[PDB]
Amino acid sequence: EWQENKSWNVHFTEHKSQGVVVLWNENEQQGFTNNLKRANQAFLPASTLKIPNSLIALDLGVVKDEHQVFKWDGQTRDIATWNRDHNLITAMKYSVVPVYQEFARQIGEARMSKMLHAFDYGNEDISGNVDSFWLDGGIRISATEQISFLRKLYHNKLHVSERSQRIVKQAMLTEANGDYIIRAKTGYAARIEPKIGWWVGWVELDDNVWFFAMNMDMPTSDGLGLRQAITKEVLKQEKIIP
Amino acid sequence: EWQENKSWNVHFTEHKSQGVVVLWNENEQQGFTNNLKRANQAFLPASTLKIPNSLIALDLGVVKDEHQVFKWDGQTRDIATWNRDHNLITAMKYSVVPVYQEFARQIGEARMSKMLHAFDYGNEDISGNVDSFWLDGGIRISATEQISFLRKLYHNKLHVSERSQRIVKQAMLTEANGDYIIRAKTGYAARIEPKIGWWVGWVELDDNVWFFAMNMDMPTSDGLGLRQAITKEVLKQEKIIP
Ligand SMILES: [Cl-]
Ligand SMILES: [Cl-]
Ligand SMILES: [Cl-]
Ligand SMILES: [Cl-]
Ligand SMILES: [Cl-]
């Protein structure tokens, strides 16, 4: 069904980068990618896992609502945006590990793992857990599998309450203007080679939705902004955004 | 409690305009306005009434969700954006009267009026209904009363379901970036003198919310864009947005 579009590769090669973008046109039920093999290659999810972990935290009542404040413990960590109070909205915006580590302590490895499987979120890998259970959830996930999960979230079809799904979609809000809305989540799997950056989400237009999932080789946090830039170059080429 | 800030008047006079901006700092429970008398002056709500009317339509099941399509009837009306299919999101974005007129036909004048009173939305005026019941709801509302209603919506405190309130807040989304989110609704009461333009809503920041409600004299649809521009000049002066 899927269509390969190798002309998107220039957006990667212009930035001396290697990666994949996957797009799904919801109205047409049609997928597109620059590289079919890499679209199906599973990687550690890094902070893209915050989307399902937020659903779990809400649906178990670990997080009461998007307003609840998770106070800073006063310990100065390396990422300055972590050294402040957060709610679910801001914890997702700044990918605040200490906040989600606390969620995971309350959720527990057993509940987390079972609810992820109920979401059909990626698949367990031969390597098992390679860090802490909350950083990778014992799974790896491909770009096409991200799309399938996000489509379920969009349609409120995951096996958590509608409310939990609506709150997470709110927390995903990244950009909005008169032309489009982007709901998305970044990630950077930076501990184990190959180091991988992600951006996954969707673009809402007046009359359609375009799901996207991209990942790219990211040996250093220098090209982090290429995750969004390359994706947007594809979206612009396809006339999805101006 | 309220504080008057007459330095905001220049943003109106620079555009040969007269009007009011009201701001409410949620963390501090403090209100500010350029003109206390006009802040309390009631006007026809025009399309700002689409916020409560959307709540009513959802909570009665006239609108099933924000995805339901209200097809164009194929009749070419004066406003080009009306001459197409819409959902609740787009009907609010383009202030699509024919769509909301159909909602009102299904809701009914009795249910609409009673639910508006349950929201404490403005007050009935001596003039009664001055057009059709769905265009003004038999009420007039002040900028400060808009604030009070919007604060209830923000906190899910209105007497409709939480779901209905969350869907309407989604449909209010107007702009979002790394610095702020604006959820808002325009209006233009253009049939009866004095003709009035409105913009009402809030600005979400990482650590606070600022509610706003502005109206202005609008003898012609030429300065419609001043509703947002003047509001944003106030927000910038107050360092709420960059
Ligand atoms: Cl693994
Ligand atoms: Cl994002
Ligand atoms: Cl009236
Ligand atoms: Cl939203
Ligand atoms: Cl607006």
Residue numbers in the entry:
A (entry chain A), B (entry chain A): 24 to 265
Authors' description from the paper:
OXA-48 confers resistance to many carbapenem and penicillin β-lactams, but only slowly hydrolyses oxyimino-cephalosporins such as ceftazidime (CAZ). Low catalytic activity for CAZ hydrolysis has been attributed to the substrate’s bulkiness, potentially requiring sampling of alternative loop conformations to promote cephalosporin binding and hydrolysis. Here we reveal how directed evolution of a β-lactamase yielded highly epistatic activity enhancements. We describe how distinct mutations shifted the rate-limiting step from substrate binding to the chemical reaction in the β-lactamase OXA-48, thereby causing strong phenotypic epistasis.
